[PDB]
Amino acid sequence: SKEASALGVQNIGGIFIVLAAGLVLSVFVAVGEFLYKSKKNA
Amino acid sequence: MLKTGVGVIRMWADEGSRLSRFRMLFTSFVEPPCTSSTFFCHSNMCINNSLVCNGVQNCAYPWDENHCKLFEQITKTHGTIIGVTSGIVLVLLIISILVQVKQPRKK
């Protein structure tokens, strides 16, 4: 009985990593779609 | 405990000069009961001239040099570093966002 343990990044880091991955994929697919629409319109 | 006020410590060695160590401490004023100048640690052990919290186990039990008693959130190993960098990223992003807050309109 010692488990008075505040959760810290050492036990929760993964969500931030997933966050950065999502951000980069967002940039990727967003510019891909914008240029796709620009090329299709022309 | 010395009953008198003058101490006598003799040591004998006989080609045993390497006798590991005799390393000990003597305390004054072990004699008087409490007065403001002094400090109580044990029964009739008010001794203090200055030895209140002198960084040495200055009494029989730890009583004298012994447990006398927003910047922390700043002092992080690298959480402070990447946190303030993230705040910088935030500020720049806000700078960018206010533009399209104020600049564009409908078609």
């Binding site: 009985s1 959760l7 969500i15 951000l23 994929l25 967003a30 | 992003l93």
Partner: protein
């Protein structure tokens, strides 16, 4: 705030804000969000997106809140970033509730000491007594495994914790943890001379208060019958009241 370390909270908020900026720069810079306004719309030409800074920020907040939002993100980019955001939120709040469950339950299930053996299984809260005050001596001659190991621990400490004076140990217990084994009577007196101090467990030992008389004593049996009377009257219970119960009920807070 306790279940979460005083860092993630700030990480939480900054992630919220950065995500929000990402969201809005996605929406107002997007080939899709621009929208025909009229409910019955015959291909108008005043189309626009439907995101503000205020809207996207509060939407991010609300999804972080598990209370929905007002904007319905539509395109691929906004939907994928919002999906990641929702994932962030659910995992964080789930973890939060798990941890708070952890604290409250690990608290509730603690069992504060209530018996001498239980103290023996304990390690942090120290043992001891007034040295050689016939008390630890009983432990010295003790045969009970609980008391055997209690004396073993005291021999381990061996003036590490063996107070010389009753009051000195009283201060020790007041300022820290301690066991401070000593006679019941003074204990109830002190406890009802004070607070913060509790009787714990039963009477580990049993001793009596008689009257001393020489071998030659006719008064022995006479005074014993006198005290049998006084006890059977409860009159000595009454005088206990006088000296403890009378002055041992000023302090029930």
């Amino acid at each position: 705030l306790n279940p979460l370390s005083p860092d993630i909270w700030m990480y939480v908020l900054l992630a919220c804000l950065g995500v929000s900026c990402v969201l809005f720069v996605i929406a107002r810079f997007s080939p899709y969000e621009w929208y025909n306004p009229h409910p019955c719309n015959p291909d108008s030409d005043v189309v626009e997106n439907n995101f503000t800074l205020l809207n996207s920020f509060w939407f991010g907040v609300g999804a972080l809140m598990q209370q929905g939002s007002e904007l319905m993100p539509k395109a691929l980019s906004t939907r994928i970033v919002g999906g990641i955001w929702w994932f962030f939120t659910l995992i964080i709040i789930s973890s939060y509730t798990a941890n708070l469950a952890a604290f409250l339950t690990v608290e509730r299930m603690e069992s504060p000491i209530d018996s001498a053996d239980d103290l023996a299984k304990q390690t942090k809260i120290e043992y001891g007594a007034v040295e050689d005050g016939a008390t630890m001596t009983f432990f010295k001659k003790s045969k009970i495994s609980t008391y055997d190991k209690m004396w073993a621990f005291m021999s381990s400490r061996r003036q590490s914790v063996l107070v010389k004076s009753n009051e000195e140990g009283i201060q020790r217990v007041l300022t820290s943890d301690y066991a401070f084994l000593m006679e019941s009577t003074t204990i109830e007196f002190v406890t009802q001379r004070n607070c913060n101090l509790t009787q714990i467990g039963g009477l580990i030992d049993s001793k009596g208060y008689g009257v001393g008389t020489p071998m030659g004593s006719p008064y022995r049996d006479k005074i014993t019958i006198a005290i049998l009377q006084l006890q059977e009257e409860g009159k000595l219970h009454m005088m206990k009241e006088k000296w403890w119960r009378g002055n041992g009920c000023p302090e029930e807070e």
